[PDB]
């Protein structure tokens, strides 16, 4: 198969593909998270290329991973689906083998793990 | 059909003392009712002051000893020439054996040496890698003739102080190397008398904090 290295170092020690990924994030709509005393709140926005949309059926930006943890994102929507799917599977697999739902930190470490792996 | 196993007879004996251990075995190698060799040694110095014997199916025994010797060699390479302690050998051997859980080495393995406090140590393994440290252990054809003797004469089991009526066990002493070799040679003459697969010669290996010493005694050749 195909395995030509895409994410590589530049002379100044930067991985330009990872760098341009951040540029795509700063390109996407805004997301904000703030945690309270007994809560955490997530907030997003929507763009304006067109406005003849049907919003019953278009994907919301906050995704349920398990019944007790949610994931929001900025950047490429298509990419985010792949992370959300994988995160959702892991959450079920954790319940199946540890007999306990994921901790928020564990789920994060998993998703960050997947992202890291796609850099090398 | 083809049977991948054989039985080459053959009996081994490990005894641990205070600052030494002995591993001994007969030198006779057999097939059914035939003698293949009268002097084929099966107790080996493996380096790092460890002696090893894998008794039973000789082909499997050899394969195992070969691999442990190689294991010792690579341990030196990978771990800065570190001395492989007897307990660490024991464990490594469990893994060797268990790797073949579904096509086992047909052998009873005994290893001897000194623990990290300089005490004499004997470990024994079944064909699939279950192991225990012990004060002494017999292996192979005549194990069943020998072990009870050892329980009686090495661990003083069923022996009481005369006159205590039956209320005080004979005190558990440590044995000297001269005392231990007497038990070994007697255990083996007894076994030669009563088991057809034991005879010809006895090779004892003694391990102390000045290396490995070797001794050989004749056994009845019939």
């Amino acid at each position: 198969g195909y395995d030509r290295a895409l994410s590589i170092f530049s002379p100044d020690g930067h991985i330009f593909q990872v760098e341009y990924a951040l540029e795509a994030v700063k390109r996407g709509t805004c997301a904000v998270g703030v945690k309270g005393k007994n809560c955490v709140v997530l907030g997003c926005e929507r763009r304006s290329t067109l406005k003849l949309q049907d919003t019953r059926i278009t994907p919301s930006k906050v995704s349920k991973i398990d019944s007790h943890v949610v994931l929001s994102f900025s950047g490429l929507n298509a990419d985010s689906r792949i992370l959300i799917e994988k995160a959702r599977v892991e959450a079920q697999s954790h319940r199946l083998t540890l007999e306990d739902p994921v901790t928020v930190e564990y789920l994060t470490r998993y998703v960050a793990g997947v992202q890291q792996r796609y850099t090398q | 059909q083809f049977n991948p196993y054989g039985d080459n007879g053959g009996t081994i004996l490990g005894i641990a003392g205070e600052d030494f251990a002995v591993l001994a075995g007969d030198t006779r190698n057999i097939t059914d009712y035939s003698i293949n060799s009268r002097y084929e040694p099966k107790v080996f110095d493996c380096g790092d002051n460890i002696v090893m014997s894998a008794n039973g199916f000789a082909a499997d025994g050899d394969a195992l000893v070969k691999r442990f010797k190689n294991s010792v060699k690579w341990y030196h390479f990978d771990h800065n020439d570190k001395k492989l302690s007897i307990n660490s050998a024991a464990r490594n051997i469990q893994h060797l054996l268990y790797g073949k859980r579904f096509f086992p080495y047909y052998v009873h393995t005994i290893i001897a040496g000194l623990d990290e406090d300089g005490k004499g140590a004997v470990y024994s393994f079944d064909p699939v890698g279950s192991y225990e440290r012990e004060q002494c252990r017999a292996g192979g054809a005549a194990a069943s003739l020998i072990m009870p003797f050892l329980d009686n004469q090495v661990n003083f089991k069923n022996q009481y102080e005369p006159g205590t009526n039956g209320k005080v066990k004979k005190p558990l002493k440590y044995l000297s190397v001269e005392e231990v070799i007497k038990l070994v040679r007697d255990s083996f003459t007894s076994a030669t008398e009563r088991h057809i697969q034991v005879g010809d010669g006895l090779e004892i290996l003694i391990v102390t904090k000045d290396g490995v010493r070797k001794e050989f005694y004749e056994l009845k050749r019939d």
Binding site: Y2, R4, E23, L50, L52, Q53, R56, I82 | -
Partner: protein, 235 residues
């Protein structure tokens, strides 16, 4: 499949660019059905319009697509979408929900965007479908693997002109017949031909099939487009 300094996907942008030259397809969603309309790219008198299909494809019995882009790239994706629907039906003895099939197709597209070093598909789809969880649904997917839902949408050539006109004349309480009419109106004005003739068109509706409480898919015959073109004052 690589990033630009700005954070865009080179081949994806160029794929979209490719699509921007393809014959226009339109999807319009009504209270009681969905309309699909597509224009064929500069044709000829001798081009067989009878046994012809190229822009409108049936996915299962409750879902159809409109195609903008490379026909052959699209047939690859149509066929695997047809299979995904059938696996779903075999597994669950229920038809595939419209969104789920759309997500799967969009996930395949996304793949060619992240790994493999193969070129993305030069295709955009308009999905028209019905299911009993959301009813009538209109979706759009493009080479980036992105999908969104629509009341009315256009893909291919002249989507800017198209979108202005639909945004102007579309209203939530429309019937299918008005939607059919709006579809033709829009195409009439966006065409790069003199006029809009019947042989340059493909047309399909997903209705509640008059009387039954059931869902019907109609791919309009050459004669039926010629008819629907007359009563709307285009002859």
């Amino acid at each position: 499949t690589i990033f630009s300094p700005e954070g865009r996907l080179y081949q994806v942008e160029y794929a979209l660019e490719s699509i921007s030259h393809a014959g226009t397809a339109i999807g319009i969603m009504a209270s009681d059905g969905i309309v699909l309309a597509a224009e064929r790219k500069v044709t000829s008198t001798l081009l067989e319009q009878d046994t012809s299909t190229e822009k409108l494809y049936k996915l299962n019995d409750k879902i159809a697509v409109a195609v903008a882009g490379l026909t052959a790239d699209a047939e690859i994706l149509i066929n695997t979408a047809r299979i995904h629907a059938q696996n779903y039906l075999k597994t669950y003895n229920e038809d595939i929900p419209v969104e789920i099939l759309v997500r799967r197709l969009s996930d395949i597209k996304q793949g060619y965007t992240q790994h493999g070093g193969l070129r993305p598909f030069g295709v955009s789809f308009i999905y028209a479908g019905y299911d009993d969880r959301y009813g009538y649904q209109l979706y759009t997917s493009n080479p980036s693997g992105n999908y969104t839902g629509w009341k009315a949408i256009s893909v291919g050539a002249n989507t800017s002109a198209a979108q202005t006109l639909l945004q102007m004349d579309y209203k939530d309480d429309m019937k299918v017949d008005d939607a059919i009419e709006l579809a033709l109106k829009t195409l009439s004005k966006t065409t790069d031909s003199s006029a809009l003739t019947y042989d340059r068109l493909e047309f399909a509706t997903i209705r509640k099939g008059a009387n039954d409480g059931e869902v019907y898919q109609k791919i309009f015959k050459p004669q039926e487009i010629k008819d629907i073109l007359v009563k709307t004052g285009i002859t």
